[PDB]
């Protein structure tokens, strides 16, 4: 915090916890200046000498050292004083030579921060060299006249006096730095209660995000903002009168006169000893009746009756809008003036001022008119809400100027009809002189939230219609991607070198001036930040997105004879996905979360009975409903036991799958790929002993009453689940004799697409080379462009962001006076504090309601993905069904599951070949036999269309080019053929002897 | 018929311009409400990113091969009048007849000047209060080729385009899989033609009066409109306060007594934005559910003809044809 | 906490949220120490 | 249903004897708080 752009300044000796927090104080810099080696011919600066000043008349000063270098010993540091107009402040490590009465020549001694007037000394305090290890900085601040040896306070007094000089003695060391400063707002991230860095509100593009959204280390995505700045041509449109007017406001005056007698018994017998009225235009009301006239606050009988007129009498002169107005003063009684003279009287509402009056006043009320009361003057006001007359103080400056010249299409200030805004104004009267766009009462149209959408103006050849829309920066955005700021996505064109979809784009200069314009590059998939056919990298430059797709084929559908394309060779294209399957159960302890560790707050809480039952029952229900069918999910899919490690030194044939399964040398039972998944992201003793940076938030949670519960499947019972599942996928089948742990399963699962089982010595190394290329693309794919990794990222960030906002909802006070509850009862009254405490407790229980509802919605999400998970485990892993492109964009071969952060990660293996052959095809036969008969042969279902090669005839499967002689069980005999055949004269059944 | 929702309009709440009006004040009072705008922004940013990634996953898993061919239904088929069901040559938009009948039951502007319509021109009333939209990662006029390419892969997939077989041979070679043969000729050829012609006659009768897709379209469009049109009319609704607009609270009464009123009003409006963000997240869960059912039914009922009894269409199904819809 | 500069040159307590004390200091021995406050054994008991 | 006797920031739960205990133009704030709370409870019901 001792950089060349700001000086830190600790806010008064306490520290709020780990996180960003805002302050306001003298933090900036202006006129940085250096100085070094202010010593004479002596080998060390002598202690106690106050000389060596430097005249600076500024509103601050700061003497800063290099980063923790200047020790307190001899030949290194001396007095380093300011001075005010009369009083001084000087530090002195006065170790003994002969001079001061301290008598110590060592460390572990004290200091002397002491003020000094013209002749004498006072305020000796002696802070130790402990807690102040090394001289870092030294300020002197104008307001409150306080002085700051590095960080906290050492001395305040009464005055408000600016700095006049400063100066430091030292023999050698770092070159010291003098700097003066102004006062801005800033906020400082600090962990453990000591400042690391600050963010200033200096109008920088990095600063405005922190200064408006009260945070740093921001998430990725979009963020809107503002920067209000306008000194341009303002224009005012006043309310036009009939014709030929100079807008002159009338002045209605009042004065207490030599009034008459107080009233007799009747409430109609009180006479208004003034009368005024409002007709049109503008007015102001000179009330000189604040002179020794108290205001009487309304209560059950006496006082004012200002309900139905929310303004108070000394606030009429601001901009209001009435429809008819008439005020008058009247000297009646006080206890029943307004409460009777509003209902049965002649005014909408009335006020009741008072003074020192004689107590001979006959009051007005039914049945109580025989006493003697006070006589304070009561004013009347007959308000009718509307828009005909407007009350204002200053005279309107448009003096004989009919509205001919007001600006259009420029970002101006406007004050039209007493409602201040900031936007620009178009001309829309071409579409509005038709469609009777306003009725016979022509003034503005309010939209919602009290602004103006369309107003009128009068004075030209014909009346027009103007529309008000806000300026160019009403919604600017700037894109962040990953960890840092990239550029402002605005609506204006400040030579913006890039156009996105319906928005203009600029880019902030990072160091060098270049790298502003380039040719866009085509990206397959990007997870960074995506915005409408355009993708933004953390480098800063955009790159347009265009999705790829892979080929597929269903090709044999055969009419009249023509050659067809069926594959001979084949490849495997991997595809991943992630499905969530678990949830952390919570347990809200409402009594310890709402109130702190106090003796009180609990007796006030014990009439909030059933709301803790309501906040507890839904959490208990979702906990039980998750915990039962989680064990159902574990008992439906855990195959047979198979408690065998299978730790990937098992000799397979030619399939390098040891990349994908677990290793012998690891402290946790973990393979390589889910270790790569884990590096992108319940037994403790919370009393003593930390573990990590993120796992040790459990002690901050348990000390506020948000604790977790272990699942019904225990820890180290799920790390055997994945290994047992792949062990049942591999070993299931063979009797473990003949080097077949993983290969034979794959070859006997790949020939189900055609129609054979477990063929040898053909299609054995082709599968090996194809699967080796597939796992090569797989080990390339995870680190840069995959599908599972960003899903892992979004799920982990949402699961963390649910609970970390209902912990930071504690310092957020509700409608109240403070946040903590220990010092509400100490500042104010007893029976007035209970409303504050009730508001705060109701707010915190509302926050727990939000937590429980979010947890139930997330439970519905995870139960959905868990039943999809048990369906995909039951089908894609152990079955190999023929459902086309259920899992992995094609007719799938095999899957292998792996562990994840609270889920499972699949690896699907598709079947998409590309290399084809060109072979002639035919659709049927009709052989005629010898004596008398006729039939046809059509290829049956599930055995594929049949082809010919160089004279002979062969059937084949629809996916693998595998010629084979036609047998007797693949025929369909039909008594028809219609010249779309071959018609061999001899039989082609090829039966046997 | 049936209808499945698959898309969502992304929103972007601008809290500072929505809470206070175009005023010089109300902002210095607002700058101690720091983290609640971060909380109302983070969930909208998260649902926007989580929708926008796997929407492109859904587009890249099912867009078949390209096939950037119009196939505009003057292609001579045998006896199947399917030109009712596919796109027409003379139209300003690439639109067939049936989804035009679907559209008549229900992002490039210049908001400074120039209206468009009665309902689309609420976007200028939304953008002047800070509830703006963002374009999807599949751009406009990239989804109108999607349906045409999908039916082009359903038809042309197979044959090598020689012998008058654009749509017929696919259907006859898909209908004899219920029995056990493949692509039989001169028996079962006009019976299929008469049956399918009667089926499309009942189909063209069915949409206007008694169908199943149309009322689902109606309920989905009305709910998607009614989510946002109550958090615009929640501005004039004052909370525990004295008025609704904030320009004339400071002009009627005292300074240090107005701050309680302004705090109540701002807390109420941020509560309304919280209701908006929660409703948007629930609707995202709904549309992600129907989108994964959508990619399952595109992968099975369109290009595969599996033997699952009455998965799609109350019986052992033969073929399906998808068409466009409101989102 | 004598390492990791666990409090700065202004040595007093660290408030956590809700106005309690997490780590405070004390002075008067050979060197200043650092004490931590955690609640008692029955801050969250449950009964089934 | 049991959210009826639960008063909000108010002086009582039933509304028949709010107007009988205190002033007219001071009761309307109490009644507005109570009605706003009950409509919030109906909002929770409809969302669930
Ligand atoms: C603002 O105006 C008020 C009304 O004009 C003034 O109040 C008046 O003060 C007079 C002097 O005390 C009173 O006259 C006396 O009234 C009593 C009846 O209570 C008679 O017995 C006395 O004989 C009579 N004194 C005479 C005639 O010399 C008025 O009655 C009284 N008016 C009232 C109460 O309505 C305020 O003094 C005045 N305030 C100012 C100027 O600051
Ligand atoms: C916003 O648009 C309005 C509509 O065009 C403008 O109002 C027009 O101003 C013109 C010039 O003042 C008027 O033209 C005059 O019309 C009279 C009678 O028709 C002729 O005798 C004059 O010769 C003619 N002036 C010329 C040709 O220079 C239009 O009649 C008038 N249109 C109306 C009132 O509907 C506004 O001026 C415009 N706003 C601004 C700020 O320019
Ligand atoms: C909390 O832990 C602290 C750290 O261990 C304890 O502080 C230690 O107290 C010891 C005894 O008071 C000190 O030992 C002395 O050290 C000096 C110089 O190092 C030696 O000259 C003394 O002989 C030696 N005393 C012996 C050996 O008896 C430690 O220096 C000191 N550690 C520090 C300050 O970091 C606290 O005592 C402990 N709290 C409680 C309540 O016990
Ligand atoms: C800054 O404060 C110092 C400390 O009082 C001032 O030094 C004194 O100056 C007066 C007259 O200038 C001398 O009579 C005193 O003897 C000085 N004090 C000591 C201890 O010697 C100094 O003048 C002040 N700076 C300015 C510019 O006024
Ligand atoms: C601060 O400490 C100094 C030590 O120098 C005190 O100065 C002494 O003041 C008294 C009364 O004025 C004199 O009789 C002594 O001779 C001074 N000591 C010296 C010169 O060594 C000063 O009083 C202290 N300030 C207080 C207690 O407020
Ligand atoms: C929060 O932001 C701060 C920036 O002030 C990060 O602190 C930096 O972290 C990197 C990581 O190695 C270090 O190299 C820098 O030296 C750190 N800077 C300072 C001033 O300490 C901090 O890591 C961020 N916290 C996160 C992202 O959790
Ligand atoms: C704040 O205190 C924590 C607690 O010690 C510090 O965290 C330690 O950081 C170091 C890094 O140098 C790790 O080696 C330790 O394992 C961490 N302790 C844990 C996890 O208990 C943190 O660095 C401190 N912040 C500072 C000094 O700025
Ligand atoms: C099934 O058994 C046969 C016969 O043993 C295995 O074929 C052997 O394969 C290896 C590896 O290519 C050759 O080195 C041997 O010469 C083959 N044996 C022969 C030809 O008799 C086949 O690998 C087995 N299938 C598996 C293990 O999946
Ligand atoms: C209110 O103003 C709008 C804006 O002009 C009018 O809407 C127009 O109506 C006509 C015929 O009804 C259409 O031809 C235009 O296209 C509409 N303009 C739009 C939608 O921007 C509306 O009719 C007016 N209401 C009335 C006159 O009652
Ligand atoms: C497959 O090819 C045959 C050609 O043998 C087509 O049969 C023709 O069908 C039309 C329409 O019924 C008749 O007019 C022709 O006379 C037939 N040709 C003959 C008998 O040689 C058959 O339509 C084709 N299948 C398709 C296009 O799906
Ligand atoms: C600004 O810095 C220069 C550096 O030489 C110095 O001379 C001057 O006095 C400074 N002005 C101030 C501190 O007002
Ligand atoms: C403050 O110091 C500056 C330094 O040059 C001087 O010009 C000015 O007159 C001083 N103001 C006073 C002594 O009031
Ligand atoms: C700081 O000093 C300025 C000097 O004008 C003053 O206006 C401001 O109130 C002071 N800030 C405080 C006392 O917090
Ligand atoms: C400020 O307080 C001191 C303390 O005694 C006093 O002497 C001085 O007169 C005060 N300043 C005023 C009242 O302006
Ligand atoms: C906001 O306005 C200030 C005032 O000129 C300007 O310096 C700053 O660059 C603006 N922020 C942007 C353009 O992001
Ligand atoms: C009284 O009214 C006249 C116009 O009738 C105006 O010029 C003058 O400023 C007013 N006096 C005030 C406002 O004190
Ligand atoms: C009200 O009238 C009095 C009568 O002298 C005058 O002194 C005062 O300035 C007026 N107040 C205004 C015009 O605000
Ligand atoms: C934005 O300004 C540039 C000038 O550098 C211009 O070339 C471009 O056409 C403008 N964009 C528009 C008008 O959409
Ligand atoms: C498909 O396999 C053939 C031979 O096995 C190979 O030459 C070709 O590169 C493969 N194509 C891929 C992996 O895309
Ligand atoms: C594979 O690793 C296990 C782990 O202990 C070991 O027992 C076995 O002998 C290894 N196989 C070898 C070395 O062939
Ligand atoms: C499998 O691949 C890994 C990756 O480096 C390699 O270390 C290992 O030797 C390979 N095993 C084989 C080829 O059997
Ligand atoms: C665990 O906490 C208990 C709590 O009393 C404590 O007695 C025990 O020493 C702790 N174990 C450690 C720190 O290893
Ligand atoms: C197969 O070969 C024939 C003749 O060589 C050719 O006409 C036909 O186009 C080929 N099929 C392909 C390339 O798919
Ligand atoms: C079908 O319409 C297209 C579109 O213009 C045209 O090119 C083609 O010739 C038409 N087919 C005919 C007229 O047979
Ligand atoms: C298909 O039906 C439409 C419906 O009217 C008709 O206009 C068209 O002529 C028909 N096409 C045929 C029979 O080829
Ligand atoms: C679009 O809006 C801009 C805003 O400055 C304006 O300059 C331009 O003329 C408008 N284009 C139209 C209305 O065609």
Question: If you search the block for the tokens 């002159």, which residue do you land on?
Answer: A248
* Token couple for A421: 């805004």
Q: Cβ distance A671 to A780 under 8 Å? A: no
A700 to C16: CB separation less than 8 angstroms, yes or no: yes
Burial (CB < 10 A; 0-12, 13-18, 19+), residue B275, is: middle
The DSSP H or E segment spanning A580 is strand A574-580
Q: Cβ distance A695 to A702 under 8 Å? A: no
Q: Cβ distance A909 to A901 under 8 Å? A: no
- Residue D25: which of A307, A610, A838 has the nearest Cβ? A307
User: How far apart are alpha carbons A266 and A345 in whole angstroms?
Assistant: 11
A530 to B242: CB separation less than 8 angstroms, yes or no: no
List the alpha helices (DSSP H) in A909-974: none
Long-range contacts of C39-48 (CB under 8 A, 24+ apart): C39/A597, C39/A703, C43/A592, C43/A702, C43/A703, C44/A589, C44/A592, C44/A702, C44/A705, C44/A707, C46/A587
CB burial string A845-865: b at 16+ within 10 A, e below: bebbeebbebbbebbebbbbb
> In Å, what is the CA distance from A900 to each residue of A463, A680, A788, A867, A903?
71, 11, 10, 17, 5
User: How far apart are alpha carbons A445 and A428 in whole angstroms?
Assistant: 14
> In Å, what is the CA distance from A720 to each residue of A316, A670, A899, B292?
79, 10, 10, 30
Radius of gyration of chain B (CA): 26
Task: State how far Cα A361 lies from the chain centre.
Answer: 66
| Order of all β-strands in the sheet with A176-180 | A30-35, A176-180, A60-64, A137-141, A147-149
A545 to B49: CB separation less than 8 angstroms, yes or no: no
Handedness of CA A199, A201, A202, A203 (dihedral sign): positive
Q: Which residue of B has its CA nearest to D34?
A: B240
* Token couple for B304: 């595969």
Closest by alpha carbon to A383, among A273, A244, A277?
A277
User: How far apart are alpha carbons A70 and A171 in whole angstroms?
Assistant: 11
Closest by alpha carbon to B297, among B85, B1, B4, B7?
B4
Q: Are strands A235-237 and A412-416 parallel, antiparallel or unpaired?
A: parallel
Most informative mutation of B115, B123, B124 for ligand 9 (most atoms within 8 A of CB): B115
Burial (CB < 10 A; 0-12, 13-18, 19+), residue A616, is: middle
Q: Is A518 in the pocket of ligand 13 (CB under 6 A)?
A: no
Q: Give the 3-state secondary structure of chain B.
A: CCCCCCCCCEEEECHHHHHCCCCCCCCCCHHHCHHHHHHHHHHHHHHHHHHHHHHHHHHHHHCCCCCCCCCCCCCCCCCCCCCCCCCCCCCCCCCCCHHHHHHCCCCCCCCCCCCCCCCHHHHHHHHCCCEEEECCCCCCCCCCCHHHHHHHHHHHCCCCCCCCCCCHHHHHHHHCCCCCCCCCCCCCCHHHHHHHHHHHHHHHHHCCCCCCHHHHHHHHHHHHHHHHCCCCCCCCCCCCCCCCCCCCCCCCCCHHHHHHHHHHHHHHHHHHHHHHHHHHHHHHHHHHHHHHHHHHHHHHHHCCCCCCCCCCCCCCCCCCCCCCCCC
Q: Cβ distance A242 to A459 under 8 Å? A: no
Closest by alpha carbon to C25, among C9, C39, C41?
C9
Q: What angle do CA A596, A597, A600 make, to 5 degrees?
A: 80
Residues in chain A preceding a C-to-N separation beyond 2.5 angstroms (breaks): 681
Question: If you search the block for the tokens 């485990």, which residue do you land on?
Answer: A873
Closest by alpha carbon to A905, among A775, A744, A790, A776?
A790
User: How far apart are alpha carbons A353 and A191 in whole angstroms?
Assistant: 57
* Token couple for D21: 């205990």
B45 to A548: CB separation less than 8 angstroms, yes or no: no
Atom of ligand 13 nearest to the CA of A142: 2
Q: Looking at the DSSP assignment, which residues form a beta bridge with residue A542?
A: A536
Query: At A281, is the secondary structure helix, strand, or coil?
Result: strand
Closest by alpha carbon to A169, among A52, A54, A70?
A52
Atom of ligand 19 nearest to the CA of A777: 13
Residues of C in contact with A808 (CB under 8 A): 17
Residues of B in contact with A478 (CB under 8 A): none
Overall resolution, Å: 3.9
Query: At A476, is the secondary structure helix, strand, or coil?
Result: strand
* Token couple for B98: 């049936």
Closest by alpha carbon to B179, among A974, A794, A648, A342?
A974
Query: At C18, is the secondary structure helix, strand, or coil?
Result: helix
CB burial string B203-212: b at 16+ within 10 A, e below: eeeebeeebe
User: How far apart are alpha carbons A372 and C14 in whole angstroms?
Assistant: 64
> In Å, what is the CA distance from A605 to each residue of A464, A596, D14?
63, 12, 22
User: Which distant-in-sequence residues (6+ apart) come within 8 Å of A491 by Cβ?
Assistant: A472, A473, A475, A476, A503, A504
User: How far apart are alpha carbons C40 and A634 in whole angstroms?
Assistant: 38
Tell me how far the alpha carbon of residue A394 lies from the centroid of ligand 24, in angstroms: 76
Residues of D in contact with A298 (CB under 8 A): 25
User: How far apart are alpha carbons A152 and C10 in whole angstroms?
Assistant: 6
In this structure, what DSSP letter does residue A701 have? Answer: H
- Residue A976: which of B21, B63, B187 has the nearest Cβ? B187
Packed helices B34-62 and A788-803: angle between N→C axes, nearest 10 degrees: 160
Chain C contact for A438, CB < 8 A?
Answer: no
Atom of ligand 8 nearest to the CA of A743: 28
Residues of A in contact with B139 (CB under 8 A): 501, 532-533
Tell me how far the alpha carbon of residue A569 lies from the centroid of ligand 8, in angstroms: 21
User: Which distant-in-sequence residues (6+ apart) come within 8 Å of B130 by Cβ?
Assistant: A224, A475, B13, B14, B15, B16, B17, B18
Packed helices A205-213 and B34-62: angle between N→C axes, nearest 10 degrees: 110
User: Which distant-in-sequence residues (6+ apart) come within 8 Å of A699 by Cβ?
Assistant: A684, A686, C38
User: Which distant-in-sequence residues (6+ apart) come within 8 Å of B314 by Cβ?
Assistant: none
CB burial string A242-255: b at 16+ within 10 A, e below: eeeeebebeebebe
User: How far apart are alpha carbons A487 and A500 in whole angstroms?
Assistant: 13
Tell me how far the alpha carbon of residue A707 lies from the centroid of ligand 3, in angstroms: 36
| Order of all β-strands in the sheet with A281-286 | A250-253, A281-286, A384-391, A320-324
Chain D contact for A814, CB < 8 A?
Answer: no
User: Which distant-in-sequence residues (6+ apart) come within 8 Å of B243 by Cβ?
Assistant: A310, B249, B252
Closest by alpha carbon to A821, among A602, A589, A611, A588?
A602
Q: What angle do CA B178, B180, B186 make, to 5 degrees?
A: 90
User: Which distant-in-sequence residues (6+ apart) come within 8 Å of A908 by Cβ?
Assistant: A574, A575, A576, A577, A876, A887, A888, A889, A892, A895
Beta strands in A591-717 (DSSP E): 706-709
Q: Cβ distance A580 to A861 under 8 Å? A: yes
DSSP string, A819-848: S-STTTTTTS-HHHHHHHHHHHHHHHHHHH
Tell me how crowded residue B216 is: count the other CB atoms within 10 A of its CB.
Answer: 16
Q: Cβ distance A6 to A201 under 8 Å? A: no
Closest by alpha carbon to A906, among A794, A792, A796, A799?
A792
Per the entry, the structure determination technique was cryo-EM
The ligand 2 site (C-beta within 6 Å) comprises A 408, 427, 429-430, 433, 460-462, 464
Beta strands in A418-533 (DSSP E): 419-427, 445-446, 452-457, 464-470, 476-481, 484-490, 498-499, 504-505
How many Cα neighbours within 13 Å face the side chain of C30?
1
* Token couple for A631: 């064990």
């Amino acid at each position: 915090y001792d950089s060349s752009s700001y000086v830190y300044y600790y806010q008064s000796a306490f520290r709020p916890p780990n996180g960003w927090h805002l302050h306001g104080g003298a933090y900036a810099v202006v006129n940085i200046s250096s100085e070094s080696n202010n010593a004479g011919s002596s080998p060390g600066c002598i202690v106690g000498t106050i000389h060596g000043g430097r005249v600076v008349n500024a509103s601050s000063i700061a003497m800063t050292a290099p980063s923790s270098g200047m020790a307190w010993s001899s030949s290194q540091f001396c007095t380093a004083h300011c001075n005010f107009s009369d009083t001084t402040v000087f530090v002195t490590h006065c170790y003994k030579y002969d001079g001061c009465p301290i008598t110590g020549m060592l460390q572990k001694n004290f200091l002397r921060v002491s003020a000094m007037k013209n002749g004498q000394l006072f305020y000796n305090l002696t802070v130790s060299v402990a807690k102040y290890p090394t001289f870092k900085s030294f300020q002197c601040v104008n307001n409150l006249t306080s002085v700051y040896l590095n960080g906290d306070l050492v001395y305040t007094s009464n005055e408000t006096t600016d700095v006049t000089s400063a100066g430091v003695y030292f023999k050698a060391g770092g070159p010291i730095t003098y700097k003066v400063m102004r006062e801005v707002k800033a906020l400082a991230y600090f962990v453990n209660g000591t400042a690391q860095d600050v963010i200033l509100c200096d109008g920088s593009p990095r600063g405005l995000l922190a200064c408006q959204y009260n945070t740093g280390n921001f998430s990725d995505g979009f963020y809107p903002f503002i920067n209000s700045s306008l000194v341009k041509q303002k224009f005012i449109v006043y309310r036009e009168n009939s014709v030929n007017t100079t807008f002159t406001l009338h002045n209605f005056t009042f004065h207490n006169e030599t009034g008459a007698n107080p009233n007799p018994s009747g409430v109609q017998n009180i006479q208004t000893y003034q009368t005024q009225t409002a007709q049109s235009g503008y007015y102001n009301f000179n009330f000189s009746f604040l002179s020794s006239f108290v205001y009487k606050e309304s209560n059950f009988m006496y006082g004012s009756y200002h309900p139905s007129c929310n303004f108070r009498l000394e606030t009429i002169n601001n901009g209001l809008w009435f429809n008819s107005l008439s005020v008058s003063i009247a000297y009646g009684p006080l206890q029943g003036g307004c409460k009777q003279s509003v209902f049965s009287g002649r005014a909408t509402c009335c006020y009741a001022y008072s003074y020192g009056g004689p107590s001979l006043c006959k009051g007005v009320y039914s049945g109580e008119l025989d006493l003697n009361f006070e006589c304070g003057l009561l004013v009347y006001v007959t308000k009718s809400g509307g828009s005909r007359i407007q009350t204002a103080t200053e005279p309107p400056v448009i003096t004989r100027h009919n509205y001919n010249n007001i600006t259009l299409n420029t970002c101006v200030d406007y004050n039209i009809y007493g409602r201040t805004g900031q936007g620009f104004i178009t001309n829309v009267t071409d579409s509005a002189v038709s469609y009777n766009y306003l009725a016979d009462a022509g003034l503005a149209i309010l939209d919602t939230s009290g602004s103006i959408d369309i107003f009128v103006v009068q004075g030209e050849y014909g009346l027009t219609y103007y529309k008000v829309n806000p300026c160019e920066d009403v919604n600017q955005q700037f894109v962040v991607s990953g960890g840092k700021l990239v550029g402002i996505l605005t609506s204006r064109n400040e030579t913006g070198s890039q156009l996105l979809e319906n928005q203009f784009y600029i880019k902030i200069t990072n160091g060098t001036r270049r790298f502003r314009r380039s040719i866009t590059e085509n990206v397959a998939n990007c997870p960074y930040v995506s915005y409408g056919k355009f993708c933004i990298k953390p480098d800063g430059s955009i790159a347009t997105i265009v999705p790829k797709q892979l080929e597929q084929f269903v090709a044999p559908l055969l009419n009249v004879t023509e050659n067809v394309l069926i594959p001979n060779s084949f490849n495997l294209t991997v595809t991943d996905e992630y499905i969530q399957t678990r949830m952390d159960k919570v347990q809200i302890n409402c009594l310890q979360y709402v109130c702190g560790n106090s003796l009180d707050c609990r007796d006030l809480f014990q009439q909030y009975g059933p709301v803790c039952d309501n906040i507890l029952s839904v959490v208990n229900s979702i906990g039980q409903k998750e915990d039962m069918e989680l064990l159902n999910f574990y008992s439906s899919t855990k195959p047979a036991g198979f408690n065998t490690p299978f730790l990937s030194n098992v000799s397979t044939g030619e399939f390098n799958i040891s990349l994908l399964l677990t290793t012998p040398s690891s402290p946790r039972r973990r393979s390589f790929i889910e270790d790569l998944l884990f590096t992108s992201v319940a037994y403790k003793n919370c009393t003593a002993g930390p573990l990590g940076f993120l796992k040790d938030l459990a002690c901050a949670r348990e000390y506020n009453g948000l604790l977790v519960l272990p699942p019904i499947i225990t820890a180290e019972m799920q790390t055997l689940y994945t290994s047992s599942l792949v062990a049942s996928m591999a070993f299931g089948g063979i009797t473990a004799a003949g080097a077949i742990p993983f290969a034979t399963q794959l070859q006997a699962r790949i020939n189900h697409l055609g129609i054979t089982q477990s063929l040898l010595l053909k299609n054995q190394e082709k599968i090996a080379a194809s699967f080796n290329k597939a796992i090569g693309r797989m080990q390339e794919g995870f680190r840069s462009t995959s599908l599972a990794l960003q899903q892992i990222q979004h799920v982990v960030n949402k699961q963390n962001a649910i609970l970390t906002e209902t912990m930071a909802s504690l310092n957020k006070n509700f409608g109240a006076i403070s946040s903590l509850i220990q010092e509400i009862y100490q500042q104010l009254d007893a029976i007035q504090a209970n409303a504050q405490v009730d508001r705060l407790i109701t707010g915190r229980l509302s926050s727990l309601s939000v937590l429980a509802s979010a947890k139930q919605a997330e439970h519905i999400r995870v139960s959905q993905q868990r039943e999809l998970a048990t369906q995909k485990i039951n089908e894609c892993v152990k079955s190999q069904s023929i459902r086309y492109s259920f899992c992995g964009n094609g007719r799938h071969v095999l899957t292998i599951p792996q562990n994840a952060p609270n889920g499972i990660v699949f690896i699907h293996f598709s079947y998409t070949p590309d290399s084809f052959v060109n072979v002639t095809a035919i659709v049927g036969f009709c052989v005629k036999p010898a004596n008398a008969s006729q039939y046809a042969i059509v290829p049956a279902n599930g055995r594929g269309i049949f082809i010919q090669v160089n004279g002979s005839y062969y059937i084949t499967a629809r996916d693998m080019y595998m010629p084979r002689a036609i047998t007797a069980g693949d025929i369909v005999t039909l008594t028809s053929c219609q010249a779309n055949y071959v018609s061999v004269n001899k039989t082609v059944i090829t039966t046997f002897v």
